[PDB]
Design an enzyme around this catalytic site. Structure first.
Site, PDB file in Angstrom:
ATOM      1  N   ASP A   1       8.495  43.596 138.652  1.00 21.36           N
ATOM      2  CA  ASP A   1      10.104  43.532 138.425  1.00 21.36           C
ATOM      3  C   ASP A   1      10.713  44.443 137.624  1.00 21.36           C
ATOM      4  OD1 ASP A   1      12.853  42.951 138.631  1.00 21.36           O
ATOM      5  OD2 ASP A   1      12.477  40.657 138.937  1.00 21.36           O
ATOM      6  N   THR A   2      11.287  45.658 137.972  1.00 19.14           N
ATOM      7  CA  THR A   2      11.641  46.488 137.049  1.00 19.14           C
ATOM      8  C   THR A   2      13.076  45.888 136.788  1.00 19.14           C
ATOM      9  OG1 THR A   2      12.518  47.754 138.965  1.00 19.14           O
ATOM     10  CG2 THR A   2      10.557  48.602 138.029  1.00 19.14           C
ATOM     11  N   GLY A   3      13.627  45.004 137.357  1.00 22.07           N
ATOM     12  CA  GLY A   3      14.853  44.487 137.038  1.00 22.07           C
ATOM     13  C   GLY A   3      14.896  43.377 135.909  1.00 22.07           C
TER      14      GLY A   3
HETATM   15  C1  LIG Z   1      14.684  36.655 140.287  1.00 21.07           C
HETATM   16  C2  LIG Z   1      14.320  37.824 141.399  1.00 21.07           C
HETATM   17  C3  LIG Z   1      13.202  36.972 142.180  1.00 21.07           C
HETATM   18  C4  LIG Z   1      15.255  38.380 142.022  1.00 21.07           C
HETATM   19  N1  LIG Z   1      16.286  38.807 140.979  1.00 21.07           N
HETATM   20  C5  LIG Z   1      16.184  40.076 140.942  1.00 21.07           C
HETATM   21  C6  LIG Z   1      15.830  40.382 139.248  1.00 21.07           C
HETATM   22  O1  LIG Z   1      15.176  41.680 139.223  1.00 21.07           O
HETATM   23  C7  LIG Z   1      16.932  39.991 138.265  1.00 21.07           C
HETATM   24  C8  LIG Z   1      18.242  41.239 138.214  1.00 21.07           C
HETATM   25  C9  LIG Z   1      19.200  41.044 137.472  1.00 21.07           C
HETATM   26  C10 LIG Z   1      19.202  41.495 136.277  1.00 21.07           C
HETATM   27  C11 LIG Z   1      20.281  41.538 135.138  1.00 21.07           C
HETATM   28  C12 LIG Z   1      21.089  40.396 135.264  1.00 21.07           C
HETATM   29  C13 LIG Z   1      20.988  39.587 136.510  1.00 21.07           C
HETATM   30  C14 LIG Z   1      20.048  39.748 137.450  1.00 21.07           C
HETATM   31  N2  LIG Z   1      16.354  39.866 136.940  1.00 21.07           N
HETATM   32  C15 LIG Z   1      16.188  38.817 136.120  1.00 21.07           C
HETATM   33  O2  LIG Z   1      16.484  37.639 136.905  1.00 21.07           O
HETATM   34  O3  LIG Z   1      15.712  38.810 134.950  1.00 21.07           O
HETATM   35  C16 LIG Z   1      15.929  37.917 134.103  1.00 21.07           C
HETATM   36  C17 LIG Z   1      14.537  37.624 133.162  1.00 21.07           C
HETATM   37  O4  LIG Z   1      14.400  38.971 132.467  1.00 21.07           O
HETATM   38  C18 LIG Z   1      15.896  39.079 131.999  1.00 21.07           C
HETATM   39  O5  LIG Z   1      16.462  40.304 131.967  1.00 21.07           O
HETATM   40  C19 LIG Z   1      17.077  40.523 133.055  1.00 21.07           C
HETATM   41  C20 LIG Z   1      17.806  39.207 133.204  1.00 21.07           C
HETATM   42  C21 LIG Z   1      16.927  38.306 132.888  1.00 21.07           C
HETATM   43  S1  LIG Z   1      17.781  38.511 141.745  1.00 21.07           S
HETATM   44  O6  LIG Z   1      18.976  39.211 140.680  1.00 21.07           O
HETATM   45  O7  LIG Z   1      18.318  37.077 141.522  1.00 21.07           O
HETATM   46  C22 LIG Z   1      18.199  38.974 142.958  1.00 21.07           C
HETATM   47  C23 LIG Z   1      18.260  38.098 144.384  1.00 21.07           C
HETATM   48  C24 LIG Z   1      18.467  38.572 145.630  1.00 21.07           C
HETATM   49  C25 LIG Z   1      18.820  39.772 146.028  1.00 21.07           C
HETATM   50  N3  LIG Z   1      19.116  40.352 147.252  1.00 21.07           N
HETATM   51  C26 LIG Z   1      18.906  40.615 145.079  1.00 21.07           C
HETATM   52  C27 LIG Z   1      18.719  40.205 143.751  1.00 21.07           C
END
Ligand SMILES: CC(C)CN(C[C@@H](O)[C@H](Cc1ccccc1)NC(=O)O[C@H]1CO[C@H]2OCC[C@H]21)S(=O)(=O)c1ccc(N)cc1
EC number: 3.4.23.16
Lengths: 99, 99
Positions: free
Chosen positions: B25-27
């Site tokens: 997960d790059t996000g």
């Molecule tokens: C939890 C994953 C299965 C999916 N998530 C994408 C994910 O990349 C998110 C995307 C993301 C990024 C920033 C803020 C909210 C969501 N990041 C994330 O939850 O990371 C958390 C842990 O590391 C921390 O740094 C980033 C936030 C913390 S998600 O945002 O909930 C999501 C769910 C469904 C869709 N269609 C699109 C995105």
């Protein structure tokens, strides 16, 4: 381009005539954009991640330019803390994870 | 390897001698794994996701094998719907995004 991950992979996108910053997210199945106005009918959907679910409006067949690359697909609009470009559009621009 | 995104980029990880499935997960800034027993002391951390914040336990210098690549770094343990490999570990395996 080849994006390193030392920092958040943020890029500029153009959607609905507006310029916005969004995160290239391989962990997201779908693209989610902060509250904004888009043309067309939409249907409600529930999206869940870490911390729970949020209600969003699902718009289909939306054109988005990502880093200069035109793409088309479903865009979810709702109360997201950050604009996210998901797999549904990353594939369209030929993005891959390499290591 | 070069991973396309038509499907969720899931890989096998080995942690605490156990084999689990995880999402590249790059996000995600940080790596978060589902509840499990890890060694040492932990520190508290609040993580903000799409639907809000969850409370997690931070364990440092944990050895983790990701798709056959050894990495040693911080791992968060908490109520996540899926095991996520974040940038902190992606950089250690030399992952990049390309398009
Ligand atoms: C939890 C994953 C299965 C999916 N998530 C994408 C994910 O990349 C998110 C995307 C993301 C990024 C920033 C803020 C909210 C969501 N990041 C994330 O939850 O990371 C958390 C842990 O590391 C921390 O740094 C980033 C936030 C913390 S998600 O945002 O909930 C999501 C769910 C469904 C869709 N269609 C699109 C995105």
């Amino acid at each position: 381009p080849q994006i390193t991950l030392w920092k958040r992979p943020l890029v500029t996108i153009k959607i609905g005539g507006q310029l916005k910053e969004a995160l290239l997210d391989t962990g997201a199945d779908d693209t989610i954009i902060e509250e904004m106005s888009l043309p067309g009918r939409w249907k409600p959907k529930m999206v869940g991640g870490i911390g729970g679910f949020i209600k969003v409006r699902q718009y289909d067949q939306i054109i988005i330019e990502i880093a200069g690359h035109k793409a088309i697909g479903t865009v979810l609009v709702g109360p997201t803390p950050i604009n996210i470009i998901g797999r549904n559009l990353l594939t369209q621009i030929g993005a891959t994870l390499n290591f």
